[PDB]
Amino acid sequence: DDQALSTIIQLQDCIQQAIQQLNYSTAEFLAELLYAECSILDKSSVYWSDAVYLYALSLFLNKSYHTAFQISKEFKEYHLGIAYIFGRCALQLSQGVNEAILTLLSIINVFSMVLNSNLVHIPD
Amino acid sequence: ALSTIIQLQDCIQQAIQQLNYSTAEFLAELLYAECSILDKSSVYWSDAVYLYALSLFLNKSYHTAFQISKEFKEYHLGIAYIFGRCALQLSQGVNEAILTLLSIINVFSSNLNSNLVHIPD
């Protein structure tokens, strides 16, 4: 447990590093492994939501828009970035726009769960 | 009038950092047009060309950024990187990318510091 948190932080840092350059397949593999590792952690942990959001962003980035769209629909409410990924997938695919609206309206009205984070591509 | 171009290039940095595409399309076009006239060898010229090529690359516009980076690949390392990856995507102009990047690596080998976004190490 003492090193368990360090590994997750290191994997997250590597994922932001990889996505910072135009290196996506490695970002895919690191996001996949972090998402698999975070399975044991409870859903209440911010780490699970962060890993799911990173995985969704990656799966969006490599044109695998369908898979990103499901992996965003399962936990769309938990994180703001997941909702962003869901909305992007919906606009590209014209599938399930309505729940995207129902989530985005709530998230914007409340702003003006997890809402703010230091990760990359966190929407403003 | 360099404050305005510095501000708009920072805006381009922020926009691309926000995963918005076709947003820095116009802004990079504007920087290219504005800075093509003031100089052809200044650091701002290479910076504008690199940002323009990166914006063109990211927006499924490869047959333009290809030649755009081809013209000025020898000036900035990021331009050469964009040129090489576009060569890979389009399967064209590959030998030129090989020579330019070999020259770049040899510079590191022999006894460049721009910190712009998406610049590979």
Cα B81 → chain centroid:
8
Q: Which two tokens stand for residue B118?
A: 């998406």
Cβ proximity of A26 and A68 under 8 Å:
no
DSSP state of A79: B
Resolution of this structure in Å: 5.4
Best residue of B18, B19, B57, B86 to probe chain A, by most A CBs closer than 10 Å? B19
Name the closest residue on chain A to residue B86, using Cα atoms: A22
Residue type, B4: T
- What is the distance between the alpha carbons of residues A60 and A54, in angstroms, rounded to a whole number? 10
Q: Which two tokens stand for residue A114?
A: 């997890």
Q: Which two tokens stand for residue A104?
A: 């985005």
Contacts of B66 (CB under 8 A, 6+ apart): B83, B86, B87, B90, B92, B93
DSSP string spanning B58-94?
HTT-HHHHHHHHHHTTTT-HHHHHHHHHHHHHHT-SH
Contacts of B16 (CB under 8 A, 6+ apart): B23, B24, B54, B55, B58, B117, B118
A25-33 contacts: CB < 8 A, separation 24 or more? A25/A62, A27/A58, A27/A61, A28/A58, A28/A59, A28/A62, A31/A55, A31/A57, A31/A58, A31/A59
- Closest among A1, A67, A80 to A35, alpha carbons compared: A67
Q: Which two tokens stand for residue B13?
A: 């940095």
Residue type, A91: L
Which approach determined this entry?
Answer: cryo-EM
Q: Which residues of B touch A57 (CB under 8 A)?
A: 19
Contacts of A62 (CB under 8 A, 6+ apart): A24, A25, A28
- What is the distance between the alpha carbons of residues B1 and B33, in angstroms, rounded to a whole number? 14
Distance from CA of B112 to the nearest CA of A (A): 16
Cβ proximity of B6 and B39 under 8 Å:
no
| A94 conformational bin, left if phi > 0, alpha if psi -120 to 50, beta if neither | left
- What is the distance between the alpha carbons of residues B61 and A57, in angstroms, rounded to a whole number? 22
Report helix, strand or coil for B117: coil
- What is the distance between the alpha carbons of residues A78 and A41, in angstroms, rounded to a whole number? 15
- Closest among A80, A78, A104, A79 to A91, alpha carbons compared: A104
Cβ proximity of B5 and B39 under 8 Å:
no
CB-nearest partner of B85 from A22, A57, A121: A22
Length of chain A: 124
CB-nearest partner of B118 from A21, A57, A121: A21
